[PDB]
Amino acid sequence: TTSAVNIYNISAGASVDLAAPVTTGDIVTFFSSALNLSAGAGSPNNTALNLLSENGAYLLHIAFRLQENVIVFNSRQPNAPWLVEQRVSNVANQFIGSGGKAMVTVFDHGDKYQVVINEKTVIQYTKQISGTTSSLSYNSTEGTSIFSTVVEAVTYTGLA
Amino acid sequence: TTSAVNIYNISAGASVDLAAPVTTGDIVTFFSSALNLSAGAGSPNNTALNLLSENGAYLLHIAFRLQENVIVFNSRQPNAPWLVEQRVSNVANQFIGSGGKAMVTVFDHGDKYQVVINEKTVIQYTKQISGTTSSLSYNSTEGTSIFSTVVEAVTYTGLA
DSSP string, B31-90: EES---TTS---SS-SEEEEEEETTS-EEEEEEEETTTTEEEEEEE-TTS-----EEEE-
What residue in A sits closest to B6 (Cα-Cα)?
A119
Decide the pairing of beta strands B15-22 and B133-140: antiparallel
Q: What is the resolution of this structure in A?
A: 1.9
Phi, psi of B91 (to 5 degrees): -60, -55
Which residues from chain B sit within 8 angstroms of residue A25, using beta carbons? 159
Most A CBs within 10 Å, among B2, B33, B107, to test the A interface: B107
With b meaning 16 or more CB within 10 Å and e meaning fewer, what string describes A76-115? beeeeeeeeebeeeebeebbeebeeebbbbbbbbeeebbb
The amino acid present at B53, given as its one-letter code, is S
Chain B residues with CB within 8 Å of chain A CB: 1-7, 25, 27, 29, 103, 105, 107, 109, 114, 116, 118-119, 121, 124, 154, 156, 159
Q: φ, ψ for residue A137 (rounded to 5)?
A: -130, 155
In whole angstroms, give the CA distance from residue B151 to residue B33.
Answer: 7
| Contacts (Cβ under 8 Å, ≥6 apart) of B121 | A2, A4, B114, B115
B118·A27 Cβ contact <8 A: no
| CA–CA separation, B74 and B115 (whole Å) | 13
Beta sheet of B150-157, edge-to-edge order: B4-11, B150-157, B27-32, B102-108, B112-117, B120-126
CA–CA distance, B58 with B133 (Å, rounded to integer): 9
Q: Please give the helix or strand (H or E) that residue A134 lies within, else none.
A: strand A133-142
User: What structural domains does chain B harbor?
Assistant: 1-160 (2.60.120.200)
> B122: closest CA among B58, B55, B49?
B49
State how far the Cα of A60 lies from the Cα of A50, in Å rounded to an integer.
6
Distance CA B143, CA A133 (A): 44
Rounded alpha-carbon distances, angstroms, from residue A147 to A29, A139, B77, B85, B100: 14, 11, 45, 44, 22
The CA dihedral of B31, B37, B41, B47, to the nearest 10 degrees, is 10
Q: Determine if the peptide bond prior to B44 is cis (ω within 30°).
A: yes
Q: Which residues pair with A27 in a beta bridge?
A: A107, A156
Query: What is the C-alpha to C-alpha distance for residues A1 and B109, in angstroms, rounded to an integer?
Result: 7
Rounded distance between C-alpha atoms, residue B77 and residue B55, angstroms: 9
- Specify whether the CB–CB gap between B13 and B147 falls below 8 A: no
The length of chain A, given as a count of residues: 160
> Taken in order B135, B3, B151, B104, is the CA torsion positive or negative?
positive
Experimental method: X-ray
Cα nearest neighbour of A104 on chain B: B5
| Residue B19 to residue A11: CA distance in whole angstroms | 34
Q: Which residues contact A142 (CB under 8 A, 6 or more apart)?
A: A44, A45, A46, A67
Distance from C-alpha of A152 to C-alpha of B9, rounded to nearest angstrom = 19
Chain-chain contact of A25 with B107 (C-beta, under 8 angstroms): no
CA distances from A4 to A29, A132, B101, B116, B122 (A): 14, 16, 19, 8, 12
Q: Would you say B137 and B63 are in contact if contact means Cβ atoms under 8 Å apart? A: no
Type of residue at A54: E
Shortest alpha-carbon distance between residue A113 and chain B (Å): 9
By the 8 A CB rule, do B12 and B144 touch? no
Distance CA A17, CA A99 (A): 30
* Residues in chain A closer than 8 A to B1 (CB atoms): 109
| Sign, CA torsion A116/A121/A123/A128 | positive
